[PDB]
Amino acid sequence: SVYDAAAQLTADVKKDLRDSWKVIGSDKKGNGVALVTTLFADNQETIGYFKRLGDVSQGMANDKLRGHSITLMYALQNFIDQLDNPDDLVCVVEKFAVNHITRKISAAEFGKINGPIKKVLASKNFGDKYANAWAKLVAVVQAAL
Amino acid sequence: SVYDAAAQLTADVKKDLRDSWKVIGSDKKGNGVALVTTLFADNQETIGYFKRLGDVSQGMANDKLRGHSITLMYALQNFIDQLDNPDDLVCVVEKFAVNHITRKISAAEFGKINGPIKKVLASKNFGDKYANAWAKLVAVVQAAL
Ligand code: HEM
Ligand code: HEM
């Protein structure tokens, strides 16, 4: 249940999400491309789903990949801004869930983003505590897939 | 080209866009729903395109419509944040253009959003100068359709 999952975002979890987002969200282009390209590097088997972006190995030089990555960071911005109101967080999560359901992305494969998030966070000196907080946010989307 | 339309946005136009966005972008749920519902009210012929959202006459109560409307405001947030780097503005504009090209939305039809934008701006006392600035931003997307 997406609602029960949203209920797992306690005061402490919300605070860790906001504190870490202040840093990672400050460079959406740089950190977004880092996040997406790490997903491709660590899970080569997912590249097939991103056929529209062309040659993803080009990273930042690929305009479609850059546009996609920046936009992905605004989806995360959206989630963070809705943390105060569960009903609104749920309706935006379900909107993005549909974007992935139509692409045939399951909850398990969506969860493959946790590795990249942990790595990007670690590179900015945010440890497991923060990675786990972000895993709980990702879990809300998973509940909707 | 889209780059041309983007590169033409002047300092004065960007200033007007940012100043008005500070206000209308401060309540994404409220102003986003107002924007979308006004489109339906003034251009009833477009309702059919949004069948995935269900009964749009439900307004704010319709969770799918609310999720869609909030997300639309983040696309605008994205655009506003990329104003000073035409290269980044172009790649995000083309990303959203694809979302509309796939739904068979023509440049002319995309321009129907100008009426609703003008009304929402007016509700916050932003006059014609501001509506014209926003029409210039919308025209950047139209260059991609
Ligand atoms: C933090 C997690 C993620 C977020 C917030 C996210 C967000 C997004 C957004 C905003 C889009 C654009 C939707 C559209 O315009 O149609 C998108 C597209 C996509 N996402 Fe994700 N995504 C995430 C993780 C994943 C993962 C882990 C996979 C695959 C295992 C995945 C696969 C896709 C695919 C295939 C597309 C379509 C790309 C295209 O053809 O344009 N996403 N995602
Ligand atoms: C300020 C202008 C507009 C912006 C920034 C915008 C933004 C968006 C976004 C972010 C989406 C979601 C894309 C996806 O996840 O697939 C969307 C979907 C859509 N837009 Fe727009 N849009 C605008 C104007 C319009 C106009 C004027 C029309 C129609 C005449 C239109 C028709 C559609 C349709 C049919 C969908 C699909 C809805 C669904 O089934 O989920 N858009 N738009």
Quick check: helix, strand or coil at residue B13? helix
Q: What is the DSSP letter of A40?
A: H
**Helices B86-101, B128-142: crossing angle, 10 deg rounding:** 70
Output phi, psi for B102, to 5 deg. -65, -25
CA atoms lying within 13 Å on the CB side of residue B20:
27
Q: Are A66 and A29 in contact (CB under 8 A)?
A: yes
Pairwise CB contact (< 8 Å): A70 & B82:
yes
Q: Which helix (H) or strand (E) holds A36?
A: helix A28-42
Method: X-ray
Instruction: Give the distance from residue B103's alpha carbon to the nearest chain A alpha carbon, in angstroms.
Output: 14
Q: Are B56 and B65 in contact (CB under 8 A)?
A: yes
Q: Which of B41, B124, B30 is nearest to B69 (CA)?
A: B30
Pairwise CB contact (< 8 Å): B77 & A82:
no
Q: Which of B95, B86, B114 is nearest to B6 (CA)?
A: B86
- Using an 8 Å CB-CB cutoff, list chain B residues near A94: 63-64, 67
Nearest ligand 1 atom to the CA of A49 is 35
Chain A contact present for B101, CB below 8 A: no
* Distance (Å) from CA B100 to ligand 2 centroid: 6
* Distance (Å) from CA B74 to ligand 2 centroid: 12
Q: Count Cβ neighbours within 10 Å for each residue of A3-39 and write b for 16 or more, e otherwise.
A: eebbeebeeebbebbeebbeebbeebbebbbbbbbbb
Would you give the end-to-end CA distance of chain A in angstroms?
10
| Amino acid at site B1 | S
How many whole angstroms from its chain centre is CA B65? 15
Pairwise CB contact (< 8 Å): A94 & B70:
no
B93 Cβ inside 6 Å of ligand 2: no
Header resolution in angstroms: 1.5
Quick one: B72 exposed, middle or buried, by C-beta within 10 A (0-12, 13-18, 19+)?
middle
Chain A contact present for B3, CB below 8 A: no
Residue A5's contacts (CB-CB under 8 Å, 6 or more residues apart) are A136, A139, A140, A142, A143
Instruction: Give the distance from residue A109's alpha carbon to the nearest chain B alpha carbon, in angstroms.
Output: 23
| Amino acid at site B121 | L
The three-state (H, E, C) secondary structure of chain A, written as one string? CHHHHHCCCCHHHHHHHHHHHHHHCCCHHHHHHHHHHHHHHHCHHHHHHHHHHCCHHHHHHCHHHHHHHHHHHHHHHHHHHCCCCHHHHHHHHHHHHHHHHCCCCCHHHHHHHHHHHHHHHHHCCCCHHHHHHHHHHHHHHHHCC
Quick one: A108 exposed, middle or buried, by C-beta within 10 A (0-12, 13-18, 19+)?
exposed
Superfamily name and number for B1-145: Globins (1.10.490.10)
In Å, how far are A15, B94, B99 from A1, measured between CA atoms? 23, 35, 29
